[PDB]
Amino acid sequence: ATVNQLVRKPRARKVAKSNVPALEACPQKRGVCTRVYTTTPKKPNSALRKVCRVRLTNGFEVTSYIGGEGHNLQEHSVILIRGGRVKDLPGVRYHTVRGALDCSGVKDRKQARSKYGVKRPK
Amino acid sequence: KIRTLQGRVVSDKMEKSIVVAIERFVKHPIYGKFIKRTTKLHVHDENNECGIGDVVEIRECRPLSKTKSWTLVRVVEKAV
Amino acid sequence: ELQEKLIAVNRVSKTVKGGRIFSFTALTVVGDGNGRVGFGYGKAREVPAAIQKAMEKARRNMINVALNNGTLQHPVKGVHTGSRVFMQPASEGTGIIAGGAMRAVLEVAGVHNVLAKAYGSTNPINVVRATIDGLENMNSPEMVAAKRGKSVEEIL
Amino acid sequence: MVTIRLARHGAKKRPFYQVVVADSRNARNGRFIERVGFFNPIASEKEEGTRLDLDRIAHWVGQGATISDRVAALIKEVNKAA
Amino acid sequence: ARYLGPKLKLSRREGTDLFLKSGVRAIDTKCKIEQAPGQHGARKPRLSDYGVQLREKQKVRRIYGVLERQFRNYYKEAARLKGNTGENLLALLEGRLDNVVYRMGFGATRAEARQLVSHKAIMVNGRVVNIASYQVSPNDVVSIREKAKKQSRVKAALELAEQREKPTWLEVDAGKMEGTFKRKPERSDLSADINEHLIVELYSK
Amino acid sequence: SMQDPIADMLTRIRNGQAANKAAVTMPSSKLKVAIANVLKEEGFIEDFKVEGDTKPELELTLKYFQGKAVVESIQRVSRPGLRIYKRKDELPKVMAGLGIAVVSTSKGVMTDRAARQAGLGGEIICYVA
RNA sequence: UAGCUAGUAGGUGGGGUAACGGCUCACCUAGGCGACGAUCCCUAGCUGGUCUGAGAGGAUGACCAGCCACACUGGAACUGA
RNA sequence: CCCGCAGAAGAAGCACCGGCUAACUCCGUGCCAGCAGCCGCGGUAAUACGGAGGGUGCAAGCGUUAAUCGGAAUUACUGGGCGUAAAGCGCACGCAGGCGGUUUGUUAAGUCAGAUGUGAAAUCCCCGGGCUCAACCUGGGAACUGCAUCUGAUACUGGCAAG
Ligand SMILES: [Mg+2]
Ligand SMILES: [Mg+2]
Ligand SMILES: [Mg+2]
Ligand SMILES: [Mg+2]
Ligand SMILES: [Mg+2]
Ligand SMILES: [Mg+2]
Ligand SMILES: [Mg+2]
Ligand SMILES: [Mg+2]
Ligand SMILES: [Mg+2]
Ligand SMILES: [Mg+2]
Ligand SMILES: [Mg+2]
Ligand SMILES: [Mg+2]
Ligand SMILES: [Mg+2]
Ligand SMILES: [Mg+2]
Ligand SMILES: [Mg+2]
Ligand SMILES: [Mg+2]
Ligand SMILES: [Mg+2]
Ligand SMILES: [Mg+2]
Ligand SMILES: [Mg+2]
Ligand SMILES: [Mg+2]
Ligand SMILES: [Mg+2]
Ligand SMILES: [Mg+2]
Ligand SMILES: [Mg+2]
Ligand SMILES: [Mg+2]
Ligand SMILES: [Mg+2]
Ligand SMILES: [Mg+2]
Ligand SMILES: [Mg+2]
Ligand SMILES: [Mg+2]
Ligand SMILES: [Mg+2]
Ligand SMILES: [Mg+2]
Ligand SMILES: [Mg+2]
Secondary structure: OOHHHHHOOOOOOOOOOOOOHHHOOOOOEEEEEEEEEEEEOOOOOOOOEEEEEHHHHHHHEEEEOOOOOOOOOOOEEEEEEOOOOOOOOEEEEEEEOOOOOOOOOOOOOOOOOHOOOOOOOO | OOOEEEEEEEEEOOEEEEEEEEOOEEEEEOOOOOEEEEEEEEOOOOOOOOOOEEEEEEEEOOOOOOOOOEEEEEEEOOOO | OOEEEEEEEEEOOOEEEEEEEEEEEEEEEEOOOOOEEEEOOOOOEHHHHHHHHHHHHHHHHOOEEEOOOOOOOOEEEEEEEEEEEEEEEOOOEEEEEEHHHHHHHHHHHHOOOOOEEEOOOOHHHHHHHHHHHHHHOOOHHOOOOOOOOOOOOOOO | OOOEEEEEEEEEEEEEEEEEEOOOOOOOOOOEEEEHHHHHHHHOOOOOOEEEEEEEEHHHHHHOOOOHHHHHHHHHHHHHHO | OOOOOOOOHHHHHHHOOOOOOOOOOOHHHOOOOOOOOHHHHOOOOOOHHHHHHHHHHHHHHHHHHOOOOHHHHHHHHHOOOOOOOOHHHHHHHOOOOHHHHHOOOOOOHHHHHHHHOOOEEEEEOOOOOOOOEEEEOOOOOEEOHHHHHHOHHHHHHHHHHHOOOOOOOEEEEEOOOEEOOOOOOOOOOOOOOOOOHHHHHHHHH | OOOOOHHHHHHHHHHHHHOOOOEEEOOOOHHHHHHHHHEEEEEEEEEEEEOOOOOOOEEEEEOOOOOOOOOOOEEOOOOOOOOOOOHHHHHHOHHHHOOEEEEOOOOEEEEEHHHHHHOEEEEEEEEEO
8 A cells, every 4th residue: 555565566467368369469360170060058058059179370279169050161171260259168269250261151141241251142 | 167976985995996875865756755766886086085984075087997987076074 | 497317217126925026216316407406216116106206205305506607616526335426627518428327417407517437336326325415515616705704806 | 971951751742842951871851960941842822932041051051061952042042032 | 421312211210300302392291200210110219318319419410411430520620629519510510611502502402512512513712612521711702603503403492592591600692693601600500409418428438 | 653743733623623622732833833824814713822832732713604614624645655745837726726725835834826826836735625 | 586796896007999998918905786676587679659548657669760789690800981 | 633525324332220239020940050248049929040121320331350558446656445345464572664743053955946958850739831621741839747057945854963
């Protein structure tokens, strides 16, 4: 409290811990699909959620969500990942970017097309 | 007129040298408290006449040694 | 001519023997828009009965505030349980910059231009208590001159 | 050594020169010793377009500063105007 | 950069006449003015304070034809200037060339005035100005150029103007199709059912 | 031990006012007598006196209006643990000028308004509103 | 990361630089820095400034300008103001 | 840059619509498919998933991700706490260090006032000028809240002397 005390040991701000360490201050990262599987969600909800294991260009290996209805992905697919947690699925902290290198857009979408890599329907 | 500093002799053992402390008050940049700070200077004297505890007026001069760039002007209150 | 604004409605519960009895609590605040603002709580089994009991209580229990051309006399601090409140007289044209509870109280009070900020708990009932108390404990150049035993200019 | 010359500021197609005295080795738009006038070659009518502190021009030449061809033109023009 | 959508819809949403059509008719005989646009129009929402602040800023923008980026820049400039930000904001809006030309007769609406401006039909101090948002200054003379002076739309616009209220702070010569911007309008000169304090509050939150 | 006697005076005032006491008494000192003088002259107290020679006791008669203390708040600013000095152009005004700040200048202790008008800043002893 | 330091601290004399100086050398004195953080480890070009913030502050140093360092890596010197 | 000609003729997309937050209905599926910044939503009547109609916000852009500051008074000097929510060492002595009853003299160290030098230009800000306006460029001011020196003030802190 005392000024004297602060003069001896200045106030020292806590360093913010990041929520996306595998990206290391990169908006997106590239990575190869090691395995593509489905995992059960947390106890409150219930579903079969599509995830993938991904080895990144920087050595890190992380789990990533594959959003959308339907995907054509397999081992040795190079994909782009972005930040973004899934909450009800522990370990998954990155979101696969649809529309990227080997991520196809979701079929037959009309709303939120830009979030799922879907060309403009003629 | 010559710029000069006043301080006290913390060690006079060296031959023809002395170390003087020119302690000063400075407002703390962040917390406003006025804090004592000390600056130790190697000063040149002839005859090594300055005793520890003396208050001495010193001046800046050309390099006189690896670490001495100040010389003595005069002793103030040579009593110790 | 009185102006009335509903600040918050809340659903409470009493859990009697048989189970929960639900009721509602409407915190409102009336005011004439000229140094006069009465806030009131209203607990009732139904929301309309609550808004009306609250208006009724707020209409009484009303006080006067020594405004200054639609702005405050001097900066003021307000305090109550969790909520510390602070208000400053802004120049003309800015309007009322303040939290919701304070925005409503100052609006109905007639304070046209003020800078405000709430610290700590923003619980509306205590923010309103603390803003009312802040404005009420605020004296005016003539009243301060009378208190101090001199004239106006002698303060300037 | 020390020379009086123009530094081209302004924007594309709208040159604006600041006459400055500086060490000839420094970059054209870099370190200078003193600014002493300006010269707008594209100023519209009624706008002065060219204002030179000719007394400091003198001080510096008196101390051996050279003079660009273009500032020498400006100085002769301003001396002719008035 | 320009709103090309239907007008009366904006008026219906704003629940008020926004002067977005010529005025040959009664707007209530042109649309169901009170009824809100869309299927869920008959019912009214209990609209939060943020809602009223937003809808009011939208009202002013839709009246004058200014999009958000530019309107925000107008707010920053009004705020920087001395005096009441709200009144300075309305002065700045009311000083646009499209606005002044519209309050100077030549055009039934601000859309027509804007088309006239864009199409090099208006001069200020004898120079062709072709940007709608050109800020006109006190003691200016704006005039329709000769080649555009015989356009029948402009004649009709001045007639309709003759049937509208005549704005105080501009001196308009209808014969010469020449007019003068004598002074900046005060707040008391401009309609009193445009509000400002909401707009100043909206941009501080 | 006792290391800020000016804060002590401020506190004796505030506490006697809160306790609706008619007067308060404290060991005297030139600086205290000078602050009481500025306070009295600015109308926050009735009057004051010093009594005794070897242990002079200063006595302040407090001031009330509507059975209320005239002094609403009174706080020490510059204190032994953090001296506060201000320049002429930085001189605070309390309650937007309705109150006063006591400033000690090269020409003695006076109010913020006076020192401002006289062009000399100094050490801000306390605020009174 | 609690001690660090033998050219290390100072003096005398010689040499050397455009210039003062352990810059270098021989000798003598046994010092000097360190809790107001020395030494060690990690990180890092610095500043005018930029963003944010009511302000104090926080983050930052791309472009423009001033300074420093570097030119495959590690050393050396020549010519030359 | 100006002028002439054809003809509305070549030129509108993105996100969202449970609350936070401006904007709702129907159909499809039925704790599946799926959504999600948090709280959450889906188990046959879904304003929260998918589509449609409608509306809202932006606009040659619109969203998503990454990073900083803010909100965060959530490191609090301005501007927080410590009986029970995290927090008073088990207790005491005590060197450095921080603070100091009252009076007088002196000192100009802190302090304050004034002046001089400097604080590059650019940038920020104010008043003007130039580009059809703005962006941009530019004229002149202050401001660089600092540092140094000199001359002054004795209230307060400090030093010295006497109490
Ligand atoms: Mg809190
Ligand atoms: Mg644009
Ligand atoms: Mg030698
Ligand atoms: Mg020699
Ligand atoms: Mg050296
Ligand atoms: Mg590096
Ligand atoms: Mg580097
Ligand atoms: Mg803040
Ligand atoms: Mg670069
Ligand atoms: Mg090399
Ligand atoms: Mg290479
Ligand atoms: Mg050579
Ligand atoms: Mg809503
Ligand atoms: Mg959705
Ligand atoms: Mg069904
Ligand atoms: Mg259904
Ligand atoms: Mg939603
Ligand atoms: Mg849906
Ligand atoms: Mg972000
Ligand atoms: Mg903070
Ligand atoms: Mg706390
Ligand atoms: Mg416990
Ligand atoms: Mg506990
Ligand atoms: Mg204990
Ligand atoms: Mg004392
Ligand atoms: Mg002491
Ligand atoms: Mg002094
Ligand atoms: Mg102009
Ligand atoms: Mg300029
Ligand atoms: Mg500068
Ligand atoms: Mg003394």
